[PDB]
Design an enzyme around this catalytic site. Structure first.
Site, PDB file in Angstrom:
ATOM      1  N   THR A 172       0.646  -1.158   0.308  1.00 17.19           N
ATOM      2  CA  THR A 172       0.043  -0.177  -0.197  1.00 17.19           C
ATOM      3  C   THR A 172       0.573   1.141   0.227  1.00 17.19           C
ATOM      4  O   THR A 172       0.062   2.151  -0.729  1.00 17.19           O
ATOM      5  CB  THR A 172      -0.756   0.036   1.025  1.00 17.19           C
ATOM      6  OG1 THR A 172      -1.834  -0.905   1.502  1.00 17.19           O
ATOM      7  CG2 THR A 172      -1.564   1.196   1.334  1.00 17.19           C
ATOM      8  N   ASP A 207      26.744   5.875 -14.489  1.00 19.55           N
ATOM      9  CA  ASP A 207      28.555   6.189 -13.785  1.00 19.55           C
ATOM     10  C   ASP A 207      29.385   7.129 -14.895  1.00 19.55           C
ATOM     11  O   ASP A 207      29.502   6.900 -15.320  1.00 19.55           O
ATOM     12  CB  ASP A 207      28.794   5.508 -13.194  1.00 19.55           C
ATOM     13  CG  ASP A 207      28.467   4.141 -12.210  1.00 19.55           C
ATOM     14  OD1 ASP A 207      27.239   5.473 -11.582  1.00 19.55           O
ATOM     15  OD2 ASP A 207      28.899   3.650 -11.699  1.00 19.55           O
ATOM     16  N   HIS A 250       0.007  -9.466  -0.746  1.00 20.32           N
ATOM     17  CA  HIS A 250       0.596  -9.223  -1.932  1.00 20.32           C
ATOM     18  C   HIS A 250       1.760  -8.418  -1.816  1.00 20.32           C
ATOM     19  O   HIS A 250       1.825  -8.440   0.057  1.00 20.32           O
ATOM     20  CB  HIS A 250      -0.425  -8.283  -2.429  1.00 20.32           C
ATOM     21  CG  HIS A 250      -0.480  -6.543  -1.522  1.00 20.32           C
ATOM     22  ND1 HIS A 250      -0.020  -5.944  -0.725  1.00 20.32           N
ATOM     23  CD2 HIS A 250      -1.197  -7.639  -0.156  1.00 20.32           C
ATOM     24  CE1 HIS A 250      -0.819  -5.336  -0.005  1.00 20.32           C
ATOM     25  NE2 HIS A 250      -1.883  -5.916   0.312  1.00 20.32           N
ATOM     26  N   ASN A 281      26.996   2.479  -8.175  1.00 22.28           N
ATOM     27  CA  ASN A 281      26.078   2.977  -6.498  1.00 22.28           C
ATOM     28  C   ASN A 281      25.053   2.880  -6.937  1.00 22.28           C
ATOM     29  O   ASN A 281      24.126   3.286  -6.051  1.00 22.28           O
ATOM     30  CB  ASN A 281      26.437   4.476  -6.903  1.00 22.28           C
ATOM     31  CG  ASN A 281      26.014   5.420  -8.362  1.00 22.28           C
ATOM     32  OD1 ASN A 281      25.784   4.787  -8.509  1.00 22.28           O
ATOM     33  ND2 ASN A 281      26.206   6.333  -7.669  1.00 22.28           N
ATOM     34  N   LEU A 330      21.421   4.823 -13.063  1.00 22.25           N
ATOM     35  CA  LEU A 330      22.099   6.552 -14.143  1.00 22.25           C
ATOM     36  C   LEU A 330      23.228   6.123 -13.688  1.00 22.25           C
ATOM     37  O   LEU A 330      23.794   5.488 -12.946  1.00 22.25           O
ATOM     38  CB  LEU A 330      21.697   7.748 -12.777  1.00 22.25           C
ATOM     39  CG  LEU A 330      20.950   8.404 -12.024  1.00 22.25           C
ATOM     40  CD1 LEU A 330      21.258   9.476 -11.811  1.00 22.25           C
ATOM     41  CD2 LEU A 330      19.526   7.669 -12.645  1.00 22.25           C
ATOM     42  N   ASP A 333      -3.770   0.608  -5.862  1.00 19.54           N
ATOM     43  CA  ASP A 333      -2.286   0.721  -5.426  1.00 19.54           C
ATOM     44  C   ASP A 333      -1.698  -0.497  -5.765  1.00 19.54           C
ATOM     45  O   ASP A 333      -0.422  -0.212  -6.347  1.00 19.54           O
ATOM     46  CB  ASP A 333      -2.665   1.237  -4.295  1.00 19.54           C
ATOM     47  CG  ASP A 333      -3.088   0.557  -2.804  1.00 19.54           C
ATOM     48  OD1 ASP A 333      -3.942  -0.719  -3.460  1.00 19.54           O
ATOM     49  OD2 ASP A 333      -3.070   0.628  -2.248  1.00 19.54           O
ATOM     50  N   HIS A 334      -2.509  -1.975  -5.941  1.00 20.61           N
ATOM     51  CA  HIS A 334      -1.778  -3.372  -6.167  1.00 20.61           C
ATOM     52  C   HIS A 334      -2.608  -4.432  -6.283  1.00 20.61           C
ATOM     53  O   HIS A 334      -4.064  -4.050  -5.334  1.00 20.61           O
ATOM     54  CB  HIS A 334      -1.220  -3.942  -4.851  1.00 20.61           C
ATOM     55  CG  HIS A 334      -1.451  -3.777  -3.519  1.00 20.61           C
ATOM     56  ND1 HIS A 334      -1.904  -4.401  -3.336  1.00 20.61           N
ATOM     57  CD2 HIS A 334      -1.179  -2.698  -2.700  1.00 20.61           C
ATOM     58  CE1 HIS A 334      -2.619  -4.193  -1.906  1.00 20.61           C
ATOM     59  NE2 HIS A 334      -1.502  -3.069  -1.625  1.00 20.61           N
ATOM     60  N   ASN A 354       6.341  -0.803   3.363  1.00 23.99           N
ATOM     61  CA  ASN A 354       4.984  -0.494   4.831  1.00 23.99           C
ATOM     62  C   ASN A 354       5.234  -0.376   5.993  1.00 23.99           C
ATOM     63  O   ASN A 354       4.820   0.219   7.193  1.00 23.99           O
ATOM     64  CB  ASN A 354       3.191  -1.712   5.107  1.00 23.99           C
ATOM     65  CG  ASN A 354       2.373  -1.026   3.621  1.00 23.99           C
ATOM     66  OD1 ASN A 354       2.457   0.316   3.082  1.00 23.99           O
ATOM     67  ND2 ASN A 354       2.291  -1.803   3.222  1.00 23.99           N
TER      68      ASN A 354
END
Ligand SMILES: *[C@@H]1O[C@H](CO)[C@@H](O[C@@H]2O[C@H](CO)[C@@H](O[C@@H]3O[C@H](CO[C@H]4O[C@H](CO[C@H]5O[C@H](CO)[C@@H](O)[C@H](O)[C@@H]5O[C@H]5O[C@H](CO)[C@@H](O)[C@H](O)[C@@H]5O)[C@@H](O)[C@H](O[C@H]5O[C@H](CO)[C@@H](O)[C@H](O)[C@@H]5O[C@H]5O[C@H](CO)[C@@H](O)[C@H](O)[C@@H]5O)[C@@H]4O)[C@@H](O)[C@H](O[C@H]4O[C@H](CO)[C@@H](O)[C@H](O)[C@@H]4O)[C@@H]3O)[C@H](O)[C@H]2NC(C)=O)[C@H](O)[C@H]1NC(C)=O
Ligand SMILES: C[C@H](CCC(=O)N[C@@H]1CCN(C(=O)OCc2cc(Cl)cc(Cl)c2)C1)[C@H]1CC[C@H]2[C@@H]3[C@@H](O)C[C@@H]4C[C@H](O)CC[C@]4(C)[C@H]3CC[C@]12C
Ligand SMILES: CCCCCCCC/C=C/CCCCCCCC(=O)OC[C@@H](O)COP(=O)(O)O
Ligand SMILES: [Ca+2]
Ligand code: NA
Ligand code: NA
Ligand SMILES: [Zn+2]
Ligand SMILES: [Zn+2]
Length: 774
Positions: free
Chosen positions: A155, A662, A409, A656, A660, A304-305, A176
Site C-alpha cells: 500500500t 556512472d 500481495h 552506486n 543512472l 494500488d496493487h 509498509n
C-alpha cells in the site's frame, strides 16, 4: 479547545493550541469535543426515502431531503433521484463529454482521485453484474487492461508513488515497514513515527498544486470517518465559493484488500466488498450529477496493487537454512529484507548469509540477492532504508524467520496477480478508449496535466501517456544531443600497436531508427563495418552502443578454431585509446567477449571485423555462458519469430546502484592493472515491426521492442539450474531481467529512436514499454 460549529471539515489549519475540525483532526487526537456530535452525524442513514421528501430540516440527520438541501449543499446523494424523479448516473446513457460543462466560476475541471486498496485488475471481469458504476466509468471513459504497480507491491509505497511519480527508492517509502539507520528509528502503520515528515520525500501532488496556486488538501482521511461521510464532505467542498473551493480531491477505500486477505482473491466473499465499492462510486456520481458537476469533473479510479492466493502452509522458514537465525532481523512475508539483529554483532557477515540461502532445497520458493543485484526494472536499491540482503519470494508463498488470512500481495510487480486498475473519466480523458497497460509512476504527470500544473522532477516519462487525453497541454521534445561523434579514418599502422594481441549503406541497414544521441559530454568515434555500427568511447575504451540488424533468414556460423583467441587492433583508433589483451591475461578472473557476435557475420571476410579490439568487452567466464547463448542461439531465434530484428547492445556502469549512468570517478573495478573499466550490466534493445509480416528494415507501422539489462556476475548463483545446458536456464534468467528502453537510457545517458516515421509521443510510449513474459 472550543467548538466546531460552522467549521466541520474546514479546509484551513488551526492551532496549536486551538482544536481542529478538519478531516484529519481525529488522526492527531485534536478534534474539538463536539466533533463527533456536529460533524459526524449519522441519524437516519445516507439515503433519502419517499417518506422524507420535503421534510422539515432536522439538524440531527446525516444528510437531508428538505427543499432547502440543494441551497444548503447537504442533500443525501440520492435526494433528486428519490424526490425529483431524476435518474441515477449509472442509469443514464454514456454521452461523450466534448468540453467541460461546469458552473460559472469554475476555472478548471476538478480532479477526483478514487483509490481502492488491493483492487486486482481481473476484478473488472466480474462486470456490471457486480459493479455497474465502475463498469460504466470504465466503458465510457479511458481505461487500461491493467496498471503496473511499483515494487514492493504494498500500500504505502504505491499510494505515495501515485502521488509523486517517484520510485519508492526516491520517495523514501520503501515499505509498509522500514528501518532508517541514520534516524535510528522505525516506520510502521502502528506508531507515532509515521507522522514525522522526515520519512516522506519527493513532492506529492497536493504540494505541487499548492505551490502553483491550485487549492489542494493533503489526500489522507482519518480512518474513523465512514466512506459515506467522506463522499458527502467532498460534495460539500465542491459547493464552496470559487475562492475557497479545492480543485483536487482524493477518496481512499481500504476495500477490497481487507476481504482479499481473509478470503483470497477468488473467494465468493469478494462480491459484496466489490458491490460496496461500487455503491460508494454510485454515491459520488449521483452527488456530482446533483451538483451539475458530472460532465465537469475528471475522475481517476485507480488501485494500488492486486492480490494473490497465499496461505500459512506455503511458508519458507529461514531457520531451515541459517544455523543462527537469532542474529538477524527479517522483514517477512511476500518479500524478505534481512539485516543484523544488533549492530553490536561484529561477526555478522552478509556473504555467509547469502551463501547459506542460495539454492539449497529443490523446490526453494524464495531467492536471496544483495540489493544491487536485483533486476534493475524493480529500481529497488538506492535508499539506506532498503536492507542489503533482499529476498524475492515466489508468488503464493511467504518467508518467515522461524516457525514460532489467505490472500496477500507485495510480490515482484510484474506478477499478474499484483496488477491493478486504471480508469479515467471526464472532459479531459478520451471517450470509450482502451489504452495499453502502463506503470503507476506515469500518473503523477497526467494529474499535473489535468490540473494545468508543472510537474516536479519525477520518474514518469512526460508525454508517454498523451494518448489518454483529449487535450494535451504537454508536447514533449527530443533532448538535444550533447556530444557529437568523431569519424576517424584509417590512420595507424599495425606495427604501432603494442597491445599484446594476436590473430591467425551501413547506417541505413544497421541503424534503422537512427543514431543514438549521447546526452552528456564525452569523446566517442562512430565506427562503421559491413555487419554493424558502433559508438566507441575513447574514455571507457569500448562501445557505448553497437547496432546491427539480423534478417529472418540470416545464418549462424561458429567462431572457427583458428580465430578462437583472435583480437585485431583497429587502425582507426589509437593504441592509447584501445584495450590491450595483456590486461586480460594478467586478470585471472576476467575474460572478454564481443558486442557484435562473430557468430552472426555475413561472410567469413566480414567476420574479421567482429574480432576488432574495438568490439571487445570485459566478461567473466560465468557471464560468457549467458552471453554466448544469447548471441549464438537467441538472437537468431528472435529474428526468425519476429521477421528480422534490430539489436543495440552495450555496457552499463552502475556501481552506486542509482539507476543512472556512472561517471568515471564512480567506477570501482578495472581489468587487472589496466584502466579498462568493468561493466556492472550489459544491455540489449531488440526492435522489430509490430506487424511481423513486414520485416524489420521495411516497417510501415508501429514498432515492437523488448530489452534487457543483464547483470555482469562472476558466477551464475542466481540460476539454480546453471550446471545444466544453457537451453535450461539462460532465457529464464534473461526474462527476469527484462527492462524498458527508458531504464537503459537512464543507465547509459543515450537517447534512442531519434529517426523514425512515428510521433514522438508514440515513441515515448514505446520506450516505457516492458515485456513482462506473462
Ligand atoms: C527518479 O526521479 C528522481 C527525481 O528527479 C531522481 O532522483 C533525483 O536524482 C538526483 C540525481 O541523483 C538527485 O540530485 C541530487 O540532489 C541533491 C540534493 O538532494 C536534496 O534535494 C533534492 C531536491 O529537492 C527538491 O526537488 C525535488 C526533485 O528532485 C522535489 O521532489 C523536492 O520536493 C524538492 O522540491 C523543492 O525544490 C524544487 C526546486 O529544486 C522546487 O521546484 C519545488 O517546488 C520545491 O520547492 C531532494 O530530492 C533530495 O531528496 C532526497 O533526500 C531526502 C533527504 O534524505 C529524502 O527524504 C528523499 O527521499 C530523497 O532521497 C532520494 O535521493 C537521494 C539522492 O538525492 C538518495 O541518496 C536517496 O536514497 C533517495 O533515493 C534531497 O532533499 C544534491 O546535493 C546532489 O548534488 C550533487 O550532484 C550535483 C550534480 O550537479 C553536483 O552539482 C554536486 O556536486 C553534488 O555532488 C544531486 O543534485 C535528487 O535529489 C533526486 N530526487 C529525488 C526526489 O530523489 C532519480 O534519479 C530518478 N531515478 C531514475 C532511475 O531515473
Ligand atoms: C500515514 C497516515 C495515514 C494513515 C492511514 O493508514 N491512512 C489510510 C491509508 C490511506 N488513506 C487515505 O486517505 O489515502 C488517501 C490517498 C490516496 C492516494 Cl491516490 C494517494 C495517497 Cl498518498 C493518499 C487512509 C497519514 C495521516 C496524516 C499524514 C501526514 C499529514 O497530516 C501531514 C504531512 C503531509 C505531507 O505531505 C507528508 C508528511 C505528513 C507528515 C503526512 C504523513 C502521513 C500521515 C501521518
Ligand atoms: C496541540 C497539541 C499537540 C499534540 C499533542 C500530542 C499528545 C502526545 C501523544 C502522542 C501520541 C499520539 C498523538 C499523535 C498521533 C495519534 C495517533 C492515532 O490516533 O493514530 C494511531 C495509529 O497508530 C493508528 O494506526 P492505524 O489505525 O492502524 O492506521
Ligand atoms: Ca550510477
Ligand atoms: Na583471463
Ligand atoms: Na548456479
Ligand atoms: Zn494496499
Ligand atoms: Zn493488503
Amino acid at each position: 479547545s472550543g467548538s466546531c460549529k460552522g467549521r466541520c471539515f474546514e479546509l484551513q489549519e488551526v492551532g496549536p493550541p486551538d482544536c481542529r475540525c478538519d478531516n484529519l483532526c481525529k488522526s492527531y487526537s485534536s478534534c474539538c469535543h463536539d466533533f463527533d456530535e456536529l460533524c459526524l452525524k449519522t441519524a437516519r442513514g445516507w439515503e433519502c426515502t419517499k417518506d422524507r421528501c420535503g421534510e422539515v430540516r432536522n439538524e440531527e440527520n446525516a444528510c437531508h431531503c428538505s427543499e432547502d438541501c440543494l441551497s444548503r449543499g447537504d442533500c443525501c446523494t440520492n435526494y433528486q433521484v428519490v424526490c425529483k424523479g431524476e435518474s441515477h448516473w449509472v442509469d443514464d446513457d454514456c454521452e461523450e463529454i466534448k468540453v467541460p460543462e461546469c458552473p460559472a466560476g469554475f476555472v478548471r475541471p476538478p480532479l477526483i482521485i478514487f483509490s481502492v486498496d488491493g483492487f486486482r485488475a481481473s476484478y473488472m471481469k466480474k462486470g456490471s453484474k457486480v459493479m455497474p458504476n465502475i463498469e460504466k466509468l470504465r466503458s465510457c471513459g479511458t481505461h487500461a487492461p491493467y496498471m503496473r504497480p511499483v515494487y514492493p507491491t504494498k500500500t504505502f509505497p504505491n499510494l505515495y508513488t501515485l502521488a509523486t511519480g517517484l520510485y519508492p527508492e526516491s520517495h523514501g517509502i520503501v515499505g509498509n515497514s522500514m528501518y532508517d539507520p541514520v534516524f535510528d528509528a522505525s516506520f510502521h502503520l502502528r506508531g507515532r513515527e509515521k507522522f514525522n515528515h522526515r520519512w516522506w520525500g519527493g513532492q506529492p501532488l497536493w504540494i505541487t498544486a499548492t505551490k502553483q496556486g491550485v487549492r489542494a488538501g493533503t489526500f489522507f482521511w482519518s480512518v474513523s470517518i465512514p466512506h459515506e461521510r467522506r463522499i458527502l464532505t467532498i460534495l460539500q467542498w465542491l459547493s464552496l465559493p470559487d475562492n475557497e473551493r479545492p480543485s483536487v480531491y482524493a477518496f481512499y477505500s481500504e476495500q477490497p484488500d481487507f476481504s482479499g486477505h481473509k478470503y483470497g482473491p477468488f473467494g465468493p466473499e469478494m462480491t459484496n466488498p466489490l458491490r460496496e465499492i461500487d455503491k460508494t462510486v454510485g454515491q459520488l456520481m449521483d452527488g456530482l450529477k446533483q451538483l451539475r458537476l458530472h460532465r465537469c469533473v475528471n475522475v481517476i479510479f485507480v488501485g494500488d496493487h492486486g492480490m494473490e492466493d497465499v496461505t500459512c502452509d506455503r511458508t519458507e522458514f529461514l531457520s531451515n537454512y541459517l544455523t543462527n537465525v537469532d542474529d538477524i532481523t527479517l522483514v517477512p512475508g511476500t518479500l524478505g529484507r534481512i539485516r543484523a539483529k544488533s549492530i553490536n554483532n561484529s561477526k555478522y557477515d552478509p556473504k555467509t548469509i547469502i551463501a547459506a540461502l542460495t539454492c539449497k532445497k529443490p523446490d526453494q520458493h524464495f531467492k536471496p540477492y544483495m540489493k544491487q543485484h536485483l533486476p534493475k526494472r524493480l529500481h529497488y536499491a538506492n535508499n539506506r532504508r532498503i536492507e542489503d540482503i533482499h529476498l524475492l519470494v515466489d508468488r503464493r508463498w511467504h518467508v518467515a524467520r522461524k516457525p514460532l488470512f489467505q490472500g496477500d500481495h507485495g510480490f515482484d510487480n510484474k506478477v499478474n496477480s499484483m496488477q491493478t486498475v486504471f480508469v479515467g473519466y471526464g472532459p479531459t480523458f478520451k471517450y470509450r478508449t482502451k489504452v495499453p497497460p502502463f506503470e503507476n509512476i506515469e500518473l503523477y504527470n497526467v494529474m499535473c496535466d489535468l490540473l494545468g500544473l508543472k510537474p516536479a522532477p519525477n520518474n514518469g516519462t512526460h508525454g508517454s501517456l498523451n494518448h489518454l487525453l483529449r487535450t494535451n497541454t504537454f508536447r514533449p521534445t527530443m533532448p538535444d544531443e550533447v556530444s557529437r561523434p568523431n569519424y576517424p579514418g584509417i590512420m595507424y599502422l599495425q606495427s604501432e600497436f603494442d597491445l599484446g594481441c594476436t590473430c591467425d549503406s551501413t547506417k541505413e541497414r544497421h541503424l534503422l531508427y537512427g543514431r543514438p544521441a549521447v546526452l552528456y559530454r564525452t569523446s566517442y568515434d562512430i565506427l562503421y563495418h559491413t555487419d554493424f555500427e558502433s559508438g566507441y568511447s575513447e574514455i571507457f575504451l569500448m562501445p557505448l552502443w553497437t547496432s546491427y540488424t539480423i534478417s529472418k533468414q540470416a545464418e549462424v556460423s561458429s567462431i572457427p578454431e583458428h580465430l578462437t583467441n583472435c583480437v585485431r587492433p583497429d587502425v582507426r583508433v589509437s593504441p592509447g585509446f584501445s584495450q590491450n589483451c595483456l590486461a586480460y591475461k594478467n586478470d585471472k578472473q576476467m575474460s572478454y567477449g564481443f558486442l557484435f557476435p562473430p557468430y552472426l557475420s555475413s561472410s567469413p571476410e566480414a567476420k574479421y571485423d567482429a574480432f576488432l579490439v574495438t568490439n571487445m568487452v570485459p566478461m567473466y567466464p560465468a557471464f560468457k555462458r549467458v552471453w554466448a547463448y544469447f548471441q549464438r542461439v537467441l538472437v537468431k531465434k528472435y529474428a526468425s519469430e519476429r521477421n528480422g530484428v534490430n539489436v543495440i547492445s552495450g555496457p552499463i556502469f552502475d556501481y552506486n546502484y542509482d539507476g543512472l549512468r556512472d561517471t568515471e570517478d564512480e567506477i570501482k573495478q578495472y581489468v587487472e592493472g589496466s584502466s579498462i573499466p568493468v561493466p556492472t550490466h550489459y544491455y540489449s534493445i531488440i526492435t522489430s515491426c509490430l506487424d511481423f509480416t513486414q520485416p524489420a528494415d521495411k516497417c510501415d507501422g508501429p514498432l515492437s521492442v523488448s530489452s534487457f539489462i543483464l547483470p555482469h556476475r562472476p558466477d551464475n548463483d542466481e540460476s539454480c539450474a546453471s550446471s545444466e545446458d544453457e537451453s535450461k536456464w539462460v532465457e529464464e534468467l534473461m526474462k527476469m531481467h527484462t527492462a524498458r528502453v527508458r531504464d537503459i537510457e537512464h543507465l547509459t545517458g543515450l537517447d534512442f529512436y531519434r529517426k523514425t516515421s512515428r510521433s514522438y509521443s508514440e515513441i515515448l510510449t514505446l520506450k516505457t514499454y516492458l515485456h513482462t513474459y506473462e
